[PDB]
Amino acid sequence: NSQVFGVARIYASFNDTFVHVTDLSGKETIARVTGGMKVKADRDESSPYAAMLAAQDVAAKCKEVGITAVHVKIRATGGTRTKTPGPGGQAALRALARSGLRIGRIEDVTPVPSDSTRKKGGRRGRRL
Amino acid sequence: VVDPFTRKEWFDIKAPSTFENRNVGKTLVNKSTGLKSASDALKGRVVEVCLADLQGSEDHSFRKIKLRVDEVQGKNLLTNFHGMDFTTDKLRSMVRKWQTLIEANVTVKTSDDYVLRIFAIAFTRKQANQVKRHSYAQSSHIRAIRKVISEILTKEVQGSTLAQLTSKLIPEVINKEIENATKDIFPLQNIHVRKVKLLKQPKFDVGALMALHG
Amino acid sequence: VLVQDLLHPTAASEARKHKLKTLVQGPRSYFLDVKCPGCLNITTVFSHAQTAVTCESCSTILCTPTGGKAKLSEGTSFRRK
Amino acid sequence: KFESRKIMVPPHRMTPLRNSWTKIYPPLVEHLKLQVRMNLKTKSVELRTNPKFTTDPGALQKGADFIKAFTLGFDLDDSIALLRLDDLYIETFEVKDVKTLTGDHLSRAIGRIAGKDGKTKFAIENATRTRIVLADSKIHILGGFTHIRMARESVVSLILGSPPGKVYGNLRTVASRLK
RNA sequence: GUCGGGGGCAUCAGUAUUCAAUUGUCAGAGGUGAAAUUCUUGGAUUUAUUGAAGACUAACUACUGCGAAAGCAUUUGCCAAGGACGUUUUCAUUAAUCAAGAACGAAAGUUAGGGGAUCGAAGAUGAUCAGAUACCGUCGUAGUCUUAACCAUAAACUAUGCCGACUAGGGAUCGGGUGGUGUUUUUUUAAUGACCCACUCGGCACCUUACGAGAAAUCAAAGUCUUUGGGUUCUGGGGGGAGUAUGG
């Protein structure tokens, strides 16, 4: 068909971002290895350099089939931390726009929870 | 590991016959060796997409469908209805500073040896004559709204089949027992019914539909 | 307050202001001498009743007790004082 | 055929939205040929495009953030920079993640971020070249990736504790070489 | 009649949490300011499905509501009391505090058990360069959660013992009581509910000119005290030495 929909994640985070492009199911992970292939550095990856170019690891791997339209999908961590579309998590929305992979969904899969377990740290600070 | 080349064909997905758009797009199937792995991947899979696709309405209806695929018929896949939820886009855009949420749940062995868990949430209302900042029910009436909604999700699943539940949602005849048989307490607005979790089929039958073919 | 005795104020200003705070004490509620629809016998229930009146002819519960004042069953003829 | 994004509006941001309409579409609908619909009862911020409303690849990416970033507390002035850089991003906090904060400890560790008459907030408005909004716990940053690294390390100790003058006295060890 | 995130006994749901498996997989992630600590071609981590445990009910969450205090926020059933309010019901002074005496008691800690999910004082590791400063990171016995019991410590603070008297001045609150030839969906103009204008007592608050104070920040009580006395209980006498020695 002309509109053969896929589903593309984003995985908004720091220190890297992950790209998980298979279609509609949890099988075979077609345009997926790990979206951190594209630096020569230690951690310089939440900058759009292992992030905006990680969608160009799959810009050629999506067109192993040739699919035009996917479902974009912001994802947070899943847990208890700070959870939003962040600086590594616009970039997988950035480069999928400019690579011809069309715009789908907004489902930030994370708990905005009704519980909160014993978090990472003590009374003197968790994060920065 | 096994046969790393010919894991490639395209099988589509047929919508359950109560909706409009059957042919909703091809997917890459990797199984030519053995049609139980091409059955296990096609007898229980939640394939969630929008209700904008199925019924036809410009909202991704907020209501996207857990849609458990059932059976194979040859290059086309037999399906029924499994469940539904609210996406956080409309669920979170409502909560003002001064209202009160009302929560409910009903689980009951329903009519096919199926156990349906329906979540339905309600919201208080600044009435058109309301000059309060707020709307808090006189918290027995926070209970009394929650205890008289308790009959509506009971009868409207005790009387229905698996087909009629989604068909009582497009003008929401369910609401026309919500807003006509719990309105007798406090004003409510922007009220909905949330989730259709059929998690417990405590009986899984054998399975040969032949009537929801499409 | 400037020059008036408090036998000589504006009178009804403090009259609804919570009975005992008034210049002397005078109770809030009232008496009623009313007759049921079952006997036409004058059955004096108190305005702020606490007792569910069984009829003197029937067994009908001709009032329902509520705080503040009670809630009668309709059919009671009223008149003044 | 039709091609759509869709977003709603949180209802504490409804009230800064319907009075902020008159000059958000003339910076959008005379350059970006589209149409959007505001209303009063369903809160639908509906923006969709077409092949006839040119479907070039990098055109559905940064044009939404003229109002999608207005809704998170920012103004209409800062968020045009999405269409200037490929390293201009956002940052959203959640204040109950820095520590286990409760009570007036979430008011004695908010007031020491804006400062006395905004004079710590204005001081961060000359350090990281950002905009930062205090809703209650929403704090949002339009920086540029190394600015928000030093904006995440700008509220390193504004909450958990060091004096605010020592944000430029003690933390000048971090606020110089501003690796 | 209300009221009720009040307290207690069972049931019970949540986003999911991490842990466990199936299942999908095919060469990177991890932090901190630079960095240093680990898993996997005998399958990584971003996928799809079912359980144990605990947490708290996130947003609605305040000009909040309550409870002796410590305290308490999602349902349903169960148990008394309380608080308010109404009453032309009953005792007719049964009363206030408080030497002695007795309950309760956060966090932490103390014995004997249950789980052992979450992080994690100590600790075992990697740090890592002189003390840009040592903030980092990772696992973590106990502990956090409970059961039969202690302990009797807080900035247990509104830094103000408890019963009295009056005054300001307010628009709201919440718990009760009322209905304007009082305005609309509709019980039928003011019904379920909720309203403008008024009125009452309960709890939580605010800010004005400060009459009164205070040395002063400020306080409608930290007042009515040199114009010194409504009632009652426990403390303080310069700094230390010192809440130390000694004894009970």
Descriptive keywords:
part of a larger assembly; 4 chains; A: little secondary structure; Nucleotidyltransferase, domain 5; 3-stranded mixed β-sheet; 1 helix; B: 214 residues; alpha+beta; 3-stranded antiparallel β-sheet; 7 helices; 12 strands; elongated; RNA-binding; ribosome
H/E series of chain C: EEEE
- In total, the number of strands of chain B is 12
**Main CATH class of chain C:** Mainly Beta
What is Rg of chain B? 21 Å
Query: Sheet bearing the most strands of chain B, described?
Result: 3 strands, antiparallel
The amount of helix of chain C comes to: under 10%
Q: Helical proportion of chain B? A: 10-25%
β-strand percent of chain B reads 15-25%
Report the CATH architecture of chain C: Single Sheet
Shape, per Cα inertia axes of chain C:
elongated
Global Rg of chain C: 18 Å
Q: Under CATH, the topology of chain C is which?
A: N-terminal domain of TfIIb
Report how far apart the termini of chain C are.
Answer: 34 Å
H and E order of chain B? EEHEHEEEEHEEEEHHHHE
Global shape of chain B:
elongated
Counted by DSSP, the helix tally of chain C is: 0
Strands across the major sheet of chain C, in which order? 1-2
InterPro entries (chain C): Ribosomal_eS27, Ribosomal_eS27_Zn-bd_dom_sf, Ribosomal_zn-bd
Subcellular location (chain C): Cytoplasm
Protein name (chain C): Small ribosomal subunit protein eS27A
Keywords (chain C): Cytoplasm, Metal-binding, Methylation, Ribonucleoprotein, Ribosomal protein, Zinc, Zinc-finger
SSE arrangement:
This is part of a larger assembly, with chains A (128 residues), B (214 residues), C (81 residues) and D (179 residues).
Chain A: E1 5-9, E2 21-22, E3 69-73, H1 91-97
Parallel strand pairs in A: 1-3
Antiparallel strand pairs in A: 1-2
Chain B: E1 9-11, E2 27-29, H1 37-40, E3 49-50, H2 51-54, E4 64-66, E5 69-72, E6 77-79, E7 83-85, H3 88-91, E8 101-102, E9 105-109, E10 115-119, E11 122-123, H4 140-148, H5 152-158, H6 164-167, H7 175-181, E12 195-200
Antiparallel strand pairs in B: 1-2, 3-4, 4-7, 5-6, 8-11, 9-10, 10-12
Chain C: E1 34-35, E2 42-43, E3 63-64, E4 71-72
Chain B binds one RNA strand of 248 nucleotides through helix 4.
PDB class: ribosome
Keywords: yeast pre-ribosomal particle - small ribosomal subunit, ribosome
Entry title: Early cytoplasmic yeast pre-40S particle (purified with Tsr1 as bait)
Verbal overview:
This is part of a larger assembly, with chains A (about 130 residues), B (about 210 residues), C (about 80 residues) and D (about 180 residues). Chain A has about 130 residues and is largely without helices or strands. Chain A has one domain (about 1-130): Ribosomal protein S11/S14 (Nucleotidyltransferase, domain 5). Chain A is about 5% helix and about 10% strand. Chain A has one helix and three strands. Chain B has about 210 residues and is α+β, with helices and mostly antiparallel strands. Chain B has one domain (about 5-214). Helices cover about 0% and strands about 10% of the residues of chain C. In chain C, a hairpin with a 6-residue loop joins strand 1 (about 35) and strand 2. Chain D starts with a strand and ends with a helix. Chain D is elongated. In chain D, the strands form two sheets. Chain D has a three-stranded antiparallel β-sheet with strand order 1-3-2, with no helix packed on it. The chains are: A little secondary structure (about 130), B alpha+beta (about 210), C little secondary structure (about 80), D alpha+beta (about 180). Chains in contact: A-B, A-D, B-D. Chain B binds one RNA strand of 248 nucleotides through helix 4. It is classed as ribosome. Keywords: yeast pre-ribosomal particle - small ribosomal subunit, ribosome. The entry is titled "Early cytoplasmic yeast pre-40S particle (purified with Tsr1 as bait)". Chain A: 40S ribosomal protein S14-A. Organism of A: Saccharomyces cerevisiae (strain ATCC 204508 / S288c). Chain B: 40S ribosomal protein S1-A.
